[PDB]
Design a protein around this ligand. Sequence first.
Ligand code: HEC
Ligand code: HEC
Lengths: 143, 143
Amino acid sequence: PAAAPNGISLPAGYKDWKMIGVSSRIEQNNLRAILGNDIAVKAAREGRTHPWPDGAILVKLSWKKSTHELFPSAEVPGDFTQADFMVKDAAKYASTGGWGYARWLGMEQKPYGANADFAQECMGCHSGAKAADYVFTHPAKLP
Amino acid sequence: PAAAPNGISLPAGYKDWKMIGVSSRIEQNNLRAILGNDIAVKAAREGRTHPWPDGAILVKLSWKKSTHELFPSAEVPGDFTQADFMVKDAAKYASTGGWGYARWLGMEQKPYGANADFAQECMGCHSGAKAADYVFTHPAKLP
Ligand code: HEC
Ligand code: HEC
């Protein structure tokens, strides 16, 4: 796939990354999985998030909600909508809270954003999570 | 952790397994992640699910739904409730449709079931998916 408008390349093999958590957004009618590279997953599990370490990459994968034919009360993934990424580099991405933001749309992997300044949209909401280093997700608890 | 009543041991390192899908069960008020070992993940991605191959292991992880303090419309994991497993061995588990079923409850990982016949409960529902080799989950679509 083409790079994002700010120059960020799509991380190869993100579909093999370990699970950090899951979510459902009522207003978007979607289901989401949150995965990370090994630096991200080690930080998540030890609570090294004030701040997240350089080299951590988070991905969020979104699907439209659909219902299971044999069990209609189970909400399950339908069409794939987007892959959203945050790349930690405190020096390189100082103007956007130390994070490099990027999104690719659909099974076609089309890069999102009108121009190289697109990540200001992402900051509009993610600045609300400034006390948690711009990340909303609380890693899911496991034994 | 202690073994299940049918003698199945808790699969070690399941939290490091690759993602097959996600779900939300309305009547249970939860969120779930579906992971698998590398035998199951190969079979899922290649469509080799008639039947699933011997050695495939599927896990479902469940959390109570909670809402994000900074974004109330985001439904997110709360307390960890259970880990559910299905281990494919067509010969060994021929009496339960070719799958070895087991559940461990909570952060303490307490084995579920009154006695060695507990998996007949699981079969009561999972026999509804008998045409799909007793598995409801459709692997989530990714590029
Ligand atoms: C989840 C997200 C993630 C995971 C990291 C995190 O902060 O939890 C990424 C990589 C990402 N987003 Fe953002 N996003 C928002 C909220 C509330 C959540 C948590 C709940 C859930 O699982 O859905 C997010 C909020 C918003 C938002 C407010 C309307 C906007 C405009 C955005 N996000 C925008 C972006 C991006 C701009 C292209 C981008 C690359 C994001 N998010 C990455
Ligand atoms: C999901 C499940 C999985 C993953 C494999 C699959 O079939 O998709 C495992 C390892 C497992 N269960 Fe079962 N379960 C049910 C349904 C509808 C789904 C798909 C939707 C979702 O993601 O939630 C399941 C249904 C039922 C059910 C009907 C009320 C019962 C009684 C059970 N499941 C019982 C069990 C087990 C008995 C202890 C067990 C080990 C299960 N499920 C494993």
